[PDB]
């Protein structure tokens, strides 16, 4: 459909008690996969979204992030596209723009988010090793800044 509906919903998730709803996030994501040239709108929201919502909802804020890039991850493989050499106005493009925001969110979260979200940074790390949406080197630097903020 378009931006309009996904800045909406992201809007009464802001507001949720929690920032987690499952529908939601596949609503999000479909809206995203239906408007492929326009990738660029979405990540920037989610970025927008993510950085602006409250400590609770950085979470929530991942798994948005996480439905979106391994869905954009699908539709290059099935187009037969590169996250090396993107079309940017294409899903690999989607799948780089959403890379290139990783790292800023899952900073943000562990600055912020409560310490017991902090595990479940890690099992999108493991998700994304399995999937291999991520470069081995990408993901090592994440799991090191998560484990040096789990404290002890």
Same mark, same amino acid.
């Given at each position: 459909?378009?931006?309009?509906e996904?800045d $909406?919903?992201?809007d009464?998730?802001?507001?949720? !008690?929690? $920032?987690?709803? $499952?529908?939601?996030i596949? !609503?999000?994501?479909?809206? /995203?996969?239906?408007?492929?040239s326009?990738? *660029?709108?979405f990540?920037?929201?989610?970025?927008?979204?993510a950085?602006?919502?409250?400590?609770?909802?950085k979470?929530g *804020?991942?798994?948005?992030?996480d439905?979106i890039v391994?869905?954009?991850?699908?539709?290059?493989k099935?187009?037969?596209?590169?996250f090396e050499?993107?079309v940017? %106005? /294409?899903?690999?493009?989607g799948?780089?723009?959403?890379?290139?925001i990783?790292?800023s969110?899952? *900073?943000?979260?562990?600055?912020?988010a409560?310490? %017991?979200?902090?595990?479940?940074?890690?099992?999108?790390?493991?998700?994304?090793?399995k999937? /291999?949406?991520?470069?081995?080197?990408k993901?090592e630097?994440?799991? /090191?800044?998560? !484990?040096?903020?789990?404290?002890?």
């Amino acid at each position: 459909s378009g931006i309009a509906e996904f800045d $909406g919903i992201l809007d009464s998730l802001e507001h949720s !008690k929690t $920032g987690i709803s $499952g529908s939601k996030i596949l !609503k999000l994501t479909n809206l /995203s996969m239906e408007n492929v040239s326009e990738n *660029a709108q979405f990540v920037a929201s989610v970025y927008k979204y993510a950085k602006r919502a409250p400590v609770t909802h950085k979470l929530g *804020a991942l798994y948005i992030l996480d439905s979106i890039v391994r869905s954009f991850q699908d539709g290059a493989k099935k187009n037969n596209e590169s996250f090396e050499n993107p079309v940017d %106005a /294409s899903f690999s493009g989607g799948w780089c723009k959403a890379a290139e925001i990783t790292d800023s969110l899952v *900073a943000d979260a562990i600055q912020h988010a409560p310490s %017991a979200h902090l595990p479940k940074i890690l099992k999108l790390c493991d998700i994304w090793e399995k999937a /291999s949406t991520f470069p081995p080197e990408k993901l090592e630097s994440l799991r /090191s800044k998560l !484990k040096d903020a789990m404290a002890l």
